[PDB]
Structures are given as structure tokens and as C-alpha cells.
């Protein structure tokens, strides 16, 4: 894919729409997440056009997937990242000086700094972007004022140059927000509020995921296929209120209602729908019809066609006919079926071109039941065994892959290690006896230890290892998600410790499901030392720096690093990862 840009050219026509971005770099992001945009042309601030044309980001589509380039001054061209394979990010940390971004201004307040204004935009349930007037701002009553804004689209309706001010977006899409997510879904309930948009969705999960990435959706109501009125089945309704909560909860039957999860965006699948919808046909415009042996094959053909947004496979019906079906690659103006017909024999789903906009640690992992305690390859693919070469190479502790180049582990693990260079990170491991001198391993380039760290019992017990070579993900090696700051009040109830017991090591990996126990309950058992909010306990066979991983809503979260346990009775103590999200992110980008 043509990843970088194209000063100073311009595509000819094919326009879907026109939006305003503070930059081509961002224009290219809007183009990526737009469901039809394949390419675009941005217009930078320049002598060549009136102010009213600056910052114009024009999204475009072409059937051949490209357009006629033409030379033009202060135009910038590019392609969407849909075609690309590596991760795709909405996050934009840019502050833009002397730029003022227009929208519905809903809050005026005073703020220390552009930074602390950003913190406020990010922490607010409505905020798309802000403008902050600096203390050098001519008008004495406007100095230090943090103005909070939103629009229909999430992008400003207008951009203007204005001395002595700075704008920027909500860092909700880097996992920076403190706003709590409401994961609770209310069955048989409709909401009433400003309906800001609407789509057809095969179920209330797709409905909720769409609500989440729709800039102006705070909550939603979904009308199931069993809804009385024919005209509104599978209608997914995208709502908002000024309160921001739904004013009212009306009872009913065969609707379902819930909230945007935009706050918990990483750590939840959003842009990725990998389910198949049986005896379901998704209406849209047809892009192709091809032969294929299965839906899985259909989905792949869709996924590999960049204009494709969803498909329907009609198989060899019943069990009779050649096992060759028809794959209808379809598309719409908004990435959804215009209509969802049940009972016509088709099998339907969506493109996976979408799926790399999601955090890698949100893929499913292929299960089994029931126990216990024998683990196997594939099972805990974030678990690493962290080796020391001296005195002689041996398991020093456990850790967890959280990044392409990152391990999260316990600080206390590196008591008297003078140098990164004595460390070996091995992934994919089960048996310890499987590691040999020929075994492949990652070198650690660096060790970051919470600076306020001292005694494990004192807390701050957290380390990042930056690996020397990145990890190529696989069924054996995959990151695990950090909890979301907006999940603070969540109640995990499927928790597991993994490791080799390090003290006297064990050969194969151990797995033990255990239960969190409240801080109070812990505080009561650990007489002497305090137990800060920055810890978390469990109990009722993992090693140091090892993961306390909890499964919630189909995704694994790294809830705790093991730090000081007297347990397997008495509870173990752990670093409370959620409390160090800011820190990890700062340290890692």
C-alpha cells in the first residue's frame, strides 16, 4: 500500500464527502476509518487558496481503487491504510498552535495548561476536541480558558488560524481516559433521547460496537429480529443526551439497550466482527459474485477485496448440490447492510480488512475444557519465561508480552542484576526442559523500573523490559490487554495465575484459577504492612512478575503482576496494573 503521502498532487474527483482536518496526516486517519474512503486530498494553509479552503480534507472512492493525479499547489494526497497489514491507530496526540477548531462549544473553564485542558477533554463524555487560549492571549478575560467542543462527525466543522491559541483531540482513543465505561447491557429496554443516527445490525453486539466507534453515540437501543413492527427489525439506534445518560428506561420486549464503550476502546473488539450469521442475508450493493466452497472462503475473498464491507454466501443448499456456493461481495455507504433478511438461506458476515484497527490482544484464543493443571502450547500465549545466564542460565522469573517489543514484570525481579545483557526472554514455552542452547530467545535492550520502587512490600513493584527484537505474533506468542482505566469498578470473576512456581521450579507451565479478594479482606490478613489501592490480592504455583490474568467478556486482561505472596492459607499480593496504566503508556508509546 502507498503508505506515505504525496505533496503536492491532487486526485481527480470521486468524492464522497468533505471534512476538516488540522493535517493530511490526520486526514489519512479519517479516510482510513471511513467505511468507503480509499484515498483523499488535503489542502494545507497556503497563499494559493482563500483561508476558507485551508484544512479541507476530501475523502474519495474509485472503482479501480485509484484516481488521476494532478499537480496542484499545497494539496496533499494519500491512500487509506485499509490496504495495509500493520496496526492502524486513531490516536492523535498532536497539539496544534495558532489553530482553532470549530464546533459546538459546550463548556468554558479555566485551566493550568493546554495539557490539563487535554486531560479534561479526554475525561469528558462529550468531548471530541478542545481549544485553549494561552496566558499570552490578548483578551484578558479569555486567557487560560479551556473551551470544549463536539460535532456530529468528531471532526471540526471549520478550522481557522488564530494567534496565541492551541487545539487538539480527545486522547480517548489512546487508552488515556478516566471516564468509566458501562459494560452493562439492559435487555427488554428502550431508551428515548436524541437519535443521532441509525444502522441495521444483525445483533445487539454489533450494534454496541458500532455505537462505540460512532463519534456522537453515547448509548443505543437495538430492536431484535423478533420485534413486532416489521419495518424496525435489526434496526440499531444511535442515541445521545446532554445529561449524557439516557433520561429514561422504558420497559419492552425484544429491544436491548446499552452504552458507548469508547472509553474502553483497546481491550475490546470494536471494528471487528468475525461471527457468521446463519440463514441471514445482508442487503447492499454488489461488487462481485464468485464461486466458493464455504463461507470461511467467502469471508476471505471479501477481506481481500478492499472495497468489500460485508458478504453473503449462499451455499449448495441443503446438502445436495456441488459443494460450490456463490459468494456475494457487497458494500454500502456506511459499512452496514441496508437491510437484513432472515430466512433466505444465505450465510453472512463482514470484512476482516477491518480487524487491524482493533487491538491485537482482542483476538479470540481457541479453547478447551476443563482442567487442569496440564497446560499446552497455544493456551497462555502472553506468558514468557524470563531467564538469567548467571550463575548458570536458569528461570529467573515470569512476565507477560504486552507489546511488540515489551514485557511487563515485577521490579523486585532484578534485585542485583547489573545489566540487561544477562537476561533471556523465551516465549512459546511449556516444558522448561524444552529450552536448549539452540532454542531461540529475545534479548533485553533495557530495564525500566518504577522509579519510586524500593521494597516489594512497599509497593510500586513494576518493571518493563524493552526487547531487542520485536515479536512476530502467533498462536504461541500474543499480547494480553492492559485493563482499561475506565474498567476500574469492574468485578473480575474468571482469574488465573500461570507460571512455574518460582522457591523451587517446576517443569511444565502451571495453571490455577483463583479468586480476587478485596483489599480490606487482605489488609485484615497482612497485619504489619499497608496495602495500597495500587495493589490487589487473591487466593483460595505462579512465579514472580507472573500474570494475574482475568477473562472478561471474551478478552484477557493483565490485572496483576505477582509481587509478594505467602499463599499456595493466606492471600497473594500483586501490583494492581490498572493503577499503572498512565505510567506504562508514558514509558512505551
Amino acid at each position: 500500500c502507498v503508505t506515505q503521502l504525496l505533496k503536492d498532487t491532487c486526485f481527480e474527483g470521486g468524492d464522497i464527502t468533505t471534512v476538516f482536518t488540522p493535517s493530511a496526516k490526520y486526514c489519512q486517519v479519517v479516510c482510513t476509518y471511513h467505511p468507503r474512503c480509499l484515498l483523499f486530498t488535503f489542502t494545507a494553509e497556503s497563499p494559493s487558496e482563500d483561508p476558507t479552503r485551508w484544512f479541507t480534507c476530501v475523502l474519495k472512492d474509485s472503482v479501480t481503487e485509484t484516481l488521476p493525479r494532478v499537480n496542484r499547489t499545497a494539496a496533499i494526497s494519500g491512500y487509506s491504510f485499509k490496504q495495509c497489514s500493520h496496526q492502524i491507530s486513531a490516536c492523535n496526540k498532536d497539539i496544534y498552535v495558532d489553530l482553532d477548531m470549530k464546533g459546538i462549544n459546550y463548556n468554558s473553564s479555566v485551566a493550568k495548561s493546554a495539557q490539563e485542558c487535554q486531560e479534561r477533554c479526554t475525561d469528558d463524555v462529550h468531548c471530541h476536541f478542545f481549544t485553549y487560549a494561552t496566558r499570552q492571549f490578548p483578551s484578558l478575560e479569555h486567557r487560560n480558558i479551556c473551551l470544549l467542543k463536539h460535532t456530529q462527525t468528531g471532526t471540526p466543522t471549520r478550522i481557522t488560524k488564530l494567534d496565541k491559541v492551541v487545539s487538539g483531540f480527545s486522547l480517548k482513543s489512546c487508552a488515556l481516559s478516566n471516564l468509566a465505561c458501562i459494560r452493562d447491557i439492559f435487555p427488554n429496554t428502550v431508551f428515548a433521547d436524541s437519535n443521532i443516527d441509525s444502522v441495521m445490525a444483525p445483533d445487539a453486539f454489533v450494534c454496541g460496537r458500532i455505537c462505540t466507534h460512532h463519534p456522537g453515540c453515547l448509548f443505543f437501543t437495538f430492536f431484535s429480529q423478533e420485534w413486532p413492527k416489521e419495518s424496525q427489525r435489526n434496526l440499531c439506534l444511535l442515541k445521545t443526551s446532554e445529561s449524557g445518560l439516557p433520561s429514561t428506561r422504558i420497559k419492552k420486549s425484544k429491544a436491548l439497550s446499552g452504552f458507548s464503550l469508547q472509553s474502553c476502546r483497546h481491550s475490546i473488539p470494536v471494528f471487528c466482527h468475525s461471527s457468521f450469521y446463519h440463514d441471514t442475508d445482508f442487503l447492499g450493493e454488489e461488487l462481485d459474485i464468485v464461486a466458493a466452497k464455504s463461507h470461511e472462503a467467502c469471508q476471505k475473498l471479501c477481506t481481500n477485496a478492499v472495497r468489500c464491507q460485508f458478504f453473503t454466501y449462499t451455499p449448495a443448499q441443503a446438502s445436495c448440490n456441488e459443494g460450490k456456493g456463490k459468494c456475494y461481495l457487497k458494500l454500502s455507504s456506511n459499512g452496514s447492510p441496508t437491510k437484513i433478511l432472515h430466512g433466505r438461506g444465505g450465510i453472512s458476515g463482514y470484512t476482516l480488512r477491518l480487524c487491524k484497527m482493533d487491538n491485537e490482544c482482542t483476538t479470540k484464543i481457541k479453547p478447551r475444557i476443563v482442567g487442569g493443571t496440564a497446560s499446552v502450547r497455544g493456551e497462555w500465549p502472553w506468558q514468557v519465561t524470563l531467564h538469567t545466564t548467571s550463575p548458570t542460565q536458569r528461570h529467573l522469573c515470569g512476565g507477560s508480552i504486552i507489546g511488540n517489543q515489551w514485557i511487563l514484570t515485577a521490579a523486585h525481579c532484578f534485585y542485583g542484576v547489573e545489566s540487561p545483557k544477562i537476561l533471556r526472554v523465551y516465549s512459546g514455552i511449556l516444558n522448561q526442559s524444552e529450552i536448549k542452547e539452540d532454542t531461540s530467545f529475545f534479548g533485553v535492550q533495557e530495564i525500566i523500573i518504577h522509579d519510586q520502587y524500593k521494597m516489594a512490600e512497599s509497593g510500586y513493584d513494576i518493571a518493563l523490559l524493552k526487547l531487542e527484537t520485536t515479536v512476530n505474533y502467533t498462536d504461541s506468542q500474543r499480547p494480553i490487554c492492559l485493563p482499561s482505566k475506565g474498567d476500574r469498578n469492574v468485578i473480575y470473576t474468571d482469574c488465573w495465575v500461570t507460571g512455574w512456581g518460582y522457591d523451587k521450579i517446576q517443569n511444565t507451565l502451571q495453571k490455577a484459577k483463583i479468586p480476587l479478594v478485596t483489599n480490606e479482606e487482605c489488609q485484615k490478613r497482612y497485619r504489619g504492612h499497608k496495602i495500597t489501592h495500587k495493589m490487589i490480592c487473591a487466593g483460595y504455583k505462579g512465579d514472580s512478575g507472573g500474570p494475574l490474568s482475568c477473562k472478561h467478556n471474551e478478552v484477557w486482561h493483565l490485572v496483576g503482576i505477582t509481587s509478594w505472596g505467602e499463599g499456595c492459607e493466606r492471600p497473594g499480593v500483586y501490583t494492581n496494573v490498572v493503577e499503572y496504566v498512565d505510567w506504562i503508556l508514558e514509558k512505551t508509546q
Binding site: T131, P138, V165
Partner: peptide
């Protein structure tokens, strides 16, 4: 409340 913009001066 809806607030007005910042001054152009």
C-alpha cells in the same frame, strides 16, 4: 449552555 467562540480581536 452554548458558549461563543474565541475573539478574532
Amino acid at each position: 449552555h452554548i458558549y461563543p467562540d474565541f475573539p478574532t480581536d
